[PDB]
Write a protein that binds this ligand. Sequence first.
Ligand SMILES: Nc1ncnc2c1ncn2[C@@H]1O[C@H](COP(=O)(O)OP(=O)(O)O)[C@@H](O)[C@H]1O
Ligand SMILES: [Mg+2]
Length: 602
Amino acid sequence: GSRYEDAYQYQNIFGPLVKLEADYDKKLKESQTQDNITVRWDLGLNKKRIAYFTLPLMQGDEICLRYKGDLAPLWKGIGHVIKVPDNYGDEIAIELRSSVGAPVEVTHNFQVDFVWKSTSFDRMQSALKTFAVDETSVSGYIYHKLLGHEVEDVIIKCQLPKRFTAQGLPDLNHSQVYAVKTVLQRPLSLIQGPPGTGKTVTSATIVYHLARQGNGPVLVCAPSNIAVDQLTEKIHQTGLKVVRLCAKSREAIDSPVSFLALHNQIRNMDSMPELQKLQQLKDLSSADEKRYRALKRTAERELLMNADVICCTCVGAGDPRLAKMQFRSILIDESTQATEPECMVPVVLGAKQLILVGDHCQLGPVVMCKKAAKAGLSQSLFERLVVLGIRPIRLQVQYRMHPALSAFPSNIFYEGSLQNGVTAADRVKKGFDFQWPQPDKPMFFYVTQGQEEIASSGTSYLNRTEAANVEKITTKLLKAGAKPDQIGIITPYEGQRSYLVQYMQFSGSLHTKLYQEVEIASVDAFQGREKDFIILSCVRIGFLNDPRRLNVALTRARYGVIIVGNPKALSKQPLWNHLLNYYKEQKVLVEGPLNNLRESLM
Ligand SMILES: Nc1ncnc2c1ncn2[C@@H]1O[C@H](COP(=O)(O)OP(=O)(O)O)[C@@H](O)[C@H]1O
Ligand SMILES: [Mg+2]
């Protein structure tokens, strides 16, 4: 199978895969350069200059603004993004690191360059090298297991808790008790967590018990900053001392766990007086600067080494500030959303016990370079271990959706093993006068008989008439009660996206402020997320090709899903024909005007 004979071969194969995607990312980013750009200058209340502009991306990313004009400036300046193009406008916004000599005077002939950073790629490469050359990087049993070698099982002989539920978190259910129990006694384990089944509550519980033992700080990571914040919050609810490690650039940002950030916890220490004043002084002196970094370093080191838990994105585990720290226990949440070299960044920090939590029946790792993806980069560590025979313990109680919405996804994607920790009356809105075709089934496939073109732009599709019908659905949910920001429109094409945002503006029944808050995106953007109501626009790639994309799209909703597509055309994909026939049995493949809904017979 996907079995390696040693770590040198393992590096020999994954290392090149990382190089492929690192340069692909580089070239791509360099090709995003645009010229003849109009700017709009401003001044934030911090005195840091902000610059606005539109282009023919993610918060924190660095852009490089160059003025190339006839006048006597000719200036370069780097800043970081603070607003990306969304429902408000196609505009972008950056804040300059040093606004001393910014040409606020001019505003016409600028060039924008997206600054490529090697950091993540360098750390993945370095991680692989460590896995080959440093034998202290993983226990040996872990080494044999990751390489697909057949070694006898091992049981960790820890002190088991009498009660598995942790202080401050919800009461564990049977599948979760089984998972936390089993996992504390195994040097390596996978937990599969279907939508809403308590991946993060469970993870948080496991770290509680691993931190309640006589060993060092638990390392806890995840691929996205969002995923790490959510786990950081839950760990904090259990009374443990947690430290959130932020990337230097992202340090400037406000989350629900901003007080937990290391750089903030340092800006508040009674034990370090001389440090406080120096930070309260650059509001810089050469001799004061050497004392400031020596102290900041001393402080980081204390908070880090005496924390019960260090929370970190996978790539962020390579942080220098975590220099020469080993971590006995490591847990990676949302792990099936990382590439294997990404996960190995934390793993090689001395792992004796590893727990991967994720779901290989939902979306996999994002991989730009197609050639690297097909060669193996798109398979997560979690998935490869499953292929090698490591069976995941499954969390089978879902606390997200109306039992009706869970039926189809559970049956086709989860061997019908799921159970509902919420009932129908737990997920029915109050005073909500939006009448469904079938009262106790908050769902229906609206039969839209609409045409699809290829809007003059490039290679992207859009269903013009389907977009109109989705607007009507959205208008009905809003004037029936539902808040705008609890309505998600999911579609597989960027053409439908752009056409939808602009169609709910040029000619919508209500003002563009209600629709501005309605989030429109592909399934990719919606992973690990939920809304009360989900409208699906299948304009005829995306959630109609990959079985896993359909699973994710059908499990975002809490209170109701409404699919809008052409039944005749979608029947071509096998998965959709089954979906359509099932909606028909439950009597929710409806047709006609929204206000007098009936029942199709196609
Ligand atoms: N065993 C539990 N008892 C009560 N509620 C639970 C339990 N497990 C999960 N939940 C509920 O589900 C939510 C958390 O799910 P979460 O773990 O964040 O989702 P995911 O598995 O996708 O990470 C909470 O809001 C919580 O109320
Ligand atoms: Mg989660």
